[PDB]
Design goal:
Chain lengths: 115, 115, 115, 115
């Protein structure tokens, strides 16, 4: 599992559950093609998005549907969604954890790259 | 100014200077049209991107070119850029301050919305 | 003003108003002595805490009373308060801006230091 | 394990390893008494600080020695240390994860409270 996502709720101090996540890879038209997707689990995590063999070097976009999450809670949010765009390269470490901490008018995102 | 951007560097404890910023607006055809662009000043601020008359209801994307910023400092960062996507002015005109706090593997973004 | 504090509310997308702030300085005896205190304005800012003459080299503690702020809004937050502890002016006088971004279960603090 | 700590490095995009952590409980003199301590593991975590039986309701302080961590990396940091102060109460959930994301001039902290 080379790519994991974790999403936390800073209003309730809990994992962000059932949040939809879409992952795209940059195509050589400079166009985003769907790559993987899923919903966060009860621990706010999503793994199993891809495998080592298919996760090749390239530019990836992780899109988190934060607006639906806040509306589900009856909170009016600012952002349409949160996005994380990055390059994956085989030289450096090989396991990627993308974390996102959500508030109605702010978000923070962090990447942990190990091995 | 109805739209302002402020960018800070959490490694040096300073404003992030000469960071390129591009703003887009979602068009009729669901395409991102270029709306305004600029570079942050010595105070890490960008104003004067638009006027209240031109800044109509719509969905906007503020893209902050963080990778060029870190690479010019000698650091290879995780993200390609930081993006903020939001609906603006749908309940009447407002003023928006978009702030971003940057680190090589993390960033935080906050919006302040005033009437 | 050599020491300023700015506090923002990430749930409402606004400055955090009337937040109490207390500043302490570590004394000879390794005790925290009260140094200055105040409340943030309608812009979420506090200035006028000290002068360059009084703001000598030392270790300072800025304590932001976040719990009272959230409780007055109807929310029971995680933290008792946010604290920032730092050495100031040890290489000559500087100006410090301490910013805090607040959510009920999370906060971020940033310092901007200028010569 | 009712209390876990996790510390991440936003400059290197990795766990913060070998960081010292001290935990204090508020005594009825309004004095902080040592409660537990340890160093973060290679995954940036510290568990086993206390047990369900000893972790009773009270006010706790988690102190992370961030200044030594940055100096070990040859980076000049702003803060003397990072502190998290909170009340534990038996009504609500019972498992506490305190996370801290570290930059030289900024830190963010989040609490996840489950069950």
């Amino acid at each position: 599992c080379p790519l994991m996502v974790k999403v936390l709720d800073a209003v309730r101090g809990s994992p962000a559950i059932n949040v939809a996540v879409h992952v795209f890879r940059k195509a050589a038209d400079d166009t985003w093609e769907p790559f993987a997707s899923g919903k966060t689990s009860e621990s706010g995590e999503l793994h199993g998005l891809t495998t080592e063999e298919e996760f090749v070097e390239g530019i990836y976009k992780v899109e988190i549907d934060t607006k639906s999450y806040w509306k589900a809670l009856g909170i009016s949010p600012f952002h349409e969604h949160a996005e994380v765009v990055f390059t994956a390269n085989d030289s450096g470490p090989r396991r990627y954890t993308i974390a996102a901490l959500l508030s109605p008018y702010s978000y923070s995102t962090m990447a942990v790259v190990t091995n």
